[PDB]
Amino acid sequence: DEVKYSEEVCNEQVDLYLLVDGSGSIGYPNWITKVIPMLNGLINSLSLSRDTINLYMNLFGSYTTELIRLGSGQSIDKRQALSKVTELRKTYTPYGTTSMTAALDEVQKHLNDRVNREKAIQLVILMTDGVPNSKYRALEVANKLKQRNVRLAVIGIGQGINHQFNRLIAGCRPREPNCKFYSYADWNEAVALIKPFIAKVCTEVERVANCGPWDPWTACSVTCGRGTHSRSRPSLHEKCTTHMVSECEEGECP
């Protein structure tokens, strides 16, 4: 048989992969005056914690650079994540080519390795001017991510933004105003864009678990008159009953 039980589903767990374009096309003035404050405002709006949002962060240029791993201090504490952005303002100048496909591939690898949290919403935030090393290769991996139920939002940054590509990889429809997946204004709009994707919403649902077949009932405790016997089974789930006791009769007692 099976067991039924109640449960609240809130979708509070989110693995958020922040992929930041650090390539030479971005432009140094833009980096300082626009990208850094974008990162600051965005990350400041994320209530990171062990049990809810966990941040991953990658910087992609000629190489991809994994800045923050899911689960670490910097993944779950907003203040620590902000320090990484500050470290970037002080010590990184954008240069080189644009490994966008490889950055997205790092997310794929998380899923493949089963490093993400299974019950966690998977959310990629791609921050780019939308001029990757290869347009087809980057669209391809993004589409692979979406077919795995990964959500993807795009934030345009840089001195020379290819909106057409950004809208395409975000999945924006033509003739449709205010795409819910792409923003290219300031941090305020990006934050609003990201909000519906990470909103905790609580519903009460019923759940079903297969408890597996019972073992045979034991022989009666007494071989005459009233007694009891029991049947057990492996716990295939936390909510599954594993033991029963019933009253049995083995005829009369002389």
Ligand X SMILES: *[C@@H]1O[C@@H](C)[C@@H](O)[C@@H](O[C@@H]2O[C@H](CO)[C@@H](O)[C@H](O)[C@H]2O)[C@@H]1O
The footprint of Cl ion (CB under 5 A) covers: 100-101, 132-134, 138
Cα(140)–Cα(104) distance, integer angstroms: 10
Q: Which does 222 bind (CB under 5 to 8 A by kind): ligand X, Mn ion, Cl ion, none?
A: ligand X
The gap from C-alpha 56 to its chain's centroid, in whole angstroms, comes to 10
Q: Single out the residue of 58, 64, 75, 98 in contact with Mn ion (rule: CB under 5 A).
A: 98
Amino acid at 108: Q
Q: Which CB sits closer to Mn ion, 75 or 98?
A: 98
Q: Which CB sits closer to Mn ion, 62 or 108?
A: 62
Q: Which CB sits closer to ligand X, 189 or 247?
A: 247
8 Å CB contact between 242 and 228: no
Q: By C-alpha distance, which of 195, 53, 70, 43 is closest to 127?
A: 43
Site string for ligand X, 202-241 (x = CB under 6 A): --------------------xxxx----------------
**Residue-wise DSSP of 87-146:** HHHHH----S---HHHHHHHHHHHHHHT-S-TTSEEEEEEEE-S--S-HHHHHHHHHHHH
Cα(21)–Cα(94) distance, integer angstroms: 8
CA atoms within 13 A on the CB side of 187: 14
Does 232 count as an annotated binding residue? no
Does 98 count as an annotated binding residue? yes
Q: How far is the CB of 236 from ligand X (least distance, A)?
A: 35
Q: Which CB sits closer to ligand X, 29 or 225?
A: 225
Q: Which does 75 bind (CB under 5 to 8 A by kind): Mn ion, Cl ion, ligand X, none?
A: none
Stretch that binds Mn ion, among 24-32, 224-232, 235-243, 244-252 (CB under 5 A): 24-32
Query: Alpha-carbon torsion 85, 89, 93, 94, what sign?
Result: positive
Q: By C-alpha distance, which of 94, 98, 103, 92 is closest to 125?
A: 103
Does 25 count as an annotated binding residue? yes
Q: Which CB sits closer to Cl ion, 67 or 100?
A: 100
The gap from C-alpha 19 to its chain's centroid, in whole angstroms, comes to 14
Q: Which does 23 bind (CB under 5 to 8 A by kind): Cl ion, ligand X, Mn ion, none?
A: Mn ion
What is the number of the residue whose Cβ is closest to ligand X? 223
Contact between 183 and Mn ion per CB under 5 A: no
Q: Helix crossing, 100-113 with 135-146: angle to 10°?
A: 30
Binding-site residues, in ranges, read 23, 25, 98
Which residues of the chain form contacts with Mn ion (CB under 5 A)? Answer: 23, 25, 98
List residues forming the annotated binding site for Mg(2+). Answer: 23, 25, 98
Binding site for Mn(2+), residues?
A: 23, 25, 98
